[PDB]
């Protein structure tokens, strides 16, 4: 144990699910498999359910198991995992045919979880992985920790994970996710869309979405020099736009910031707190919008930095006209910083770090699965003894 060919990482999210089977060994590659997170559920007279990849003869209903990051249908969710897992087996079993003795003989699974999943959901998933998929080794890695492990392993930090309809805020102290501080706001990328609809009434949804995803949309805090600029439709249609391309991100940025502030203010050990504020981690699709992260930082500074009020400072400098020492405050944060990205994953640098949580998982899985110690995953041994409850003896 274990073959690197064999490591399987799954990262399921509301819209899609990133998947990878086998680690490259030279450098880590950005996940190439992206499967929409949904399954079809046919209902068979007599009550029971059947699950397919396609609307079978238009008889099945379309189930979207994960919504706003939460599992809303645990059965369709497990069926969706099986569907992924089986597909991978078939694919490899064709290509190579000796696969069941090699690449498919011992498949350890790392499943990236979301803060919102029940213990009940996590146990059921564990049961499913050991009983239905007949897999033997499982790590359930929280998304937040994947984040901090990718980010050159930070003991103290805050994860701001911007989704489409919600943003999660998750403080990590001493490599532990602080559950009672964790929260999400019902606000994300779509907010930008919505802000823009108000600013550009005569546009439609696809036009607005296209602007957001275009080279000329940025958050300010040379394109910025031009009054108007140009970009092209999804359907090739050229669209011109004024100052609106520097708008629409503000309401979201303010909401996130207000939340970050209330959160970090409830970290009880001020020495931990100082560290967290100095390692803000921002992740998610939205964050690839040029200027966004820096704009968000800018706002956290504007709202939360402990520093002398400018008027007060200006008086003191007039007074000294007749050198001014720095006023020291008892509060934190006096320093706010974004955590430093690792620049030595070439493939990741190339594609941006909106999905860096996955790199977290590539690193953890290699660590854990290419070393003897079985301290951080459930094994068959353990499953046989405690069952799904085995899960809680290997939490991080």
């Amino acid at each position: 144990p274990f073959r690197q060919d064999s490591i399987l990482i799954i990262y399921p999210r509301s819209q899609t699910t990133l998947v990878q089977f086998g680690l490259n060994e030279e450098t880590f590659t950005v996940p190439e498999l992206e499967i929409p997170t949904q399954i079809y559920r046919t209902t068979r007279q007599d009550g029971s359910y059947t699950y397919h990849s396609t609307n079978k003869d238009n008889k099945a209903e379309l189930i979207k198991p994960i919504q706003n990051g939460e599992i809303i249908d645990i059965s369709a969710f497990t069926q969706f995992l099986r569907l992924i897992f089986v597909s991978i087996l078939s694919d490899r079993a064709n290509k190579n045919q000796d696969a069941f003795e090699a690449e498919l003989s011992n498949i350890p699974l790392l499943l990236i979880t979301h803060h919102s999943w029940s213990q009940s959901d996590l146990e059921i998933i564990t049961q499913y992985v050991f009983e239905s998929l007949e897999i033997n080794n499982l790590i359930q890695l929280p998304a937040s920790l994947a984040a901090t492990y990718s980010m050159i392993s930070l003991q103290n930090c805050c994860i701001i994970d911007v989704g489409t309809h919600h943003t999660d805020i998750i403080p990590i102290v001493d490599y532990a996710q602080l559950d009672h501080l964790v929260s999400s706001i019902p606000m994300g990328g779509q907010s930008i869309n919505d802000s823009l609809k108000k600013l550009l009434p005569q546009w439609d949804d696809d036009q607005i979405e296209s602007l957001k995803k275009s080279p000329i949309f940025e958050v300010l805090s040379k394109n910025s020099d031009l009054e108007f600029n140009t970009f092209w439709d999804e359907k090739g249609n050229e669209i011109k736009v004024g100052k609106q391309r520097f708008q629409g991100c503000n309401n979201l940025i303010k909401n996130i910031s207000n939340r970050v502030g209330l959160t970090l203010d409830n970290i009880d050990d001020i020495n931990k707190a100082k560290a967290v504020w100095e390692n803000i981690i921002i992740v998610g699709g939205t964050t690839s919008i040029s200027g966004f992260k820096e704009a968000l930082l800018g706002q956290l500074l504007k709202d939360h930095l402990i520093i002398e009020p400018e008027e007060e400072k200006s008086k003191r400098e007039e007074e000294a006209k007749s050198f001014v020492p720095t006023i020291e405050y008892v509060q934190c944060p006096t320093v706010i910083k974004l955590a430093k990205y690792p620049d030595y994953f070439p493939e990741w640098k190339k594609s941006g770090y909106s999905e860096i949580i996955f790199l977290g998982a590539q690193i953890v899985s290699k660590q854990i699965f290419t070393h003897p110690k079985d301290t951080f995953y459930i094994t068959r041994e353990k499953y046989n003894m405690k069952g799904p409850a085995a899960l809680w003896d290997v939490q991080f």
Binding site: T27, I152, P342, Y344, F345
Partner: protein, 182 residues
């Protein structure tokens, strides 16, 4: 963190081998002058004519520190005094290349007494000398200035047990020790 460091080292080697071939194929020591002057900036700001850029923080005073008592003031330990103080303000080390008889003891006494006559920190600070002259250095720490205590180390382990057993909590201005006792 350590894993990361190794991933980073490996990448750096990989990239370096790549660039090295790429740059030489299709498809004298004054680097120490300018580079070690910018490196002087590296010590000054980044660590904390060479007569100027290295000495950039300037000062001179021909008056002794007020703690020095019972001594005559000549010209040499002035220029040497604020010379080493010039090494102090810039956060720089140094070596004294002088002949002999110029009073290294004087420059250390007036050094600490002037510097931390200003800042008042005055400790903990370490001085180490040959056992051949030890109580001497304490004798110039006696008549040439009071108010800065001294921790010596001599003799059997018992006297030491008294000394670092009393000062075990680490309160003192200066420790005067010798070679093998570190």
């Amino acid at each position: 963190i350590a894993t990361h460091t190794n991933l980073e080292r490996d990448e750096q080697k990989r990239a370096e081998k790549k660039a090295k071939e790429r740059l030489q194929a299709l498809k004298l020591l004054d680097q120490t002058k300018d580079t070690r002057i910018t490196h002087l900036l590296r010590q000054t700001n980044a660590f904390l004519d060479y007569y100027n850029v290295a000495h950039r923080i300037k000062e001179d005073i021909k008056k002794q520190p007020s703690i020095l008592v019972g001594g005559t003031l000549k010209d040499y330990q002035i220029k040497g005094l604020q010379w080493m103080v010039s090494l102090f303000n810039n956060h720089l080390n140094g070596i004294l290349a002088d002949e002999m008889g110029l009073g290294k003891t004087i420059q250390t006494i007036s050094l600490l007494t002037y510097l931390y006559e200003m800042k008042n920190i005055r400790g903990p600070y370490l001085v180490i000398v040959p056992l051949s002259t030890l109580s001497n250095w304490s004798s110039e720490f006696a008549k040439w200035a009071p108010t800065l205590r001294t921790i010596s180390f001599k003799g059997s382990p018992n006297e030491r047990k008294a000394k670092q057993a009393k000062i075990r909590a680490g309160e003192f201005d200066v420790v005067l020790t010798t070679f093998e006792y570190i």
